[PDB]
Amino acid sequence: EVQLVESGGGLVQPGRSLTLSCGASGFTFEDYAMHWVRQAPGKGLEWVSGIDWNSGVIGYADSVKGRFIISRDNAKNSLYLHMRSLTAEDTALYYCAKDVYSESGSGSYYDYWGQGTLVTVSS
Amino acid sequence: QSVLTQPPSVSAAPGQKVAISCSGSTSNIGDNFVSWYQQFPGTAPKLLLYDDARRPSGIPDRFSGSKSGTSATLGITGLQTGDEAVYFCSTWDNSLNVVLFGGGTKLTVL
Amino acid sequence: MESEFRVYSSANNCTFEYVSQPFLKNLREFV
Ligand SMILES: *[C@@H]1O[C@H](CO)[C@@H](O)[C@H](O)[C@H]1NC(C)=O
Question: Which residues are glycosylated (chain C)?
Fold first, then answer.
């Protein structure tokens, strides 16, 4: 069983920053790549960020590029997403995703999904 | 930016086969097999199909479907009450270098 | 009815792994 704890999600002002922390248990964190997926209520799932075994950044969603930073620590078994220039479009539910393929180039599927935390961006 | 296309909602009587279609550009669906996710409303998404037809442990054999060309088809047989959920097809795009997620299809029983 | 991995709760900082043929009215002596 893999459990993906979710935290650091709360109501925030638009011109502010917020860090999201994912806790990984029940599997080796370094062995499996970790991804961020957000889904605003009443809207389809939207991939946000991806990272791998070597902690190299696979990429960011074009809409969040240059405003979102992804980082993970293999020793702490935790991955952190730093969000800046938050907007109403940014407001969504961010679920941790566990990826079986480290390269995530092909045939990569999410074995487990985190419960998620609700980021709200409003004045 | 290519977007995976899915029908908005599908409704079928219990015991009626359900077909869900995912439409993608050749670079995304053609290169890597689509992955289907069954998400019950108010719950975190659960992987339904890995690498197209292959099913992860804990997924019913009645769930099926075949991807031909750029289209991925999910086939549901022996439909029952409480199987209602939103289905998302996800295939990473080599050309876009980003994961692509389908809009989703709202399966339900009256 | 196999109760597996019930001997611990947390497993972090793995440093050595090894799999081989198992060690085990028969006496099984170890040192
Ligand atoms: C992991 O183990 C190494 C050596 O045993 C030790 O130096 C390090 O502090 C440990 N780190 C954690 C997070 O347990």
Answer: 13
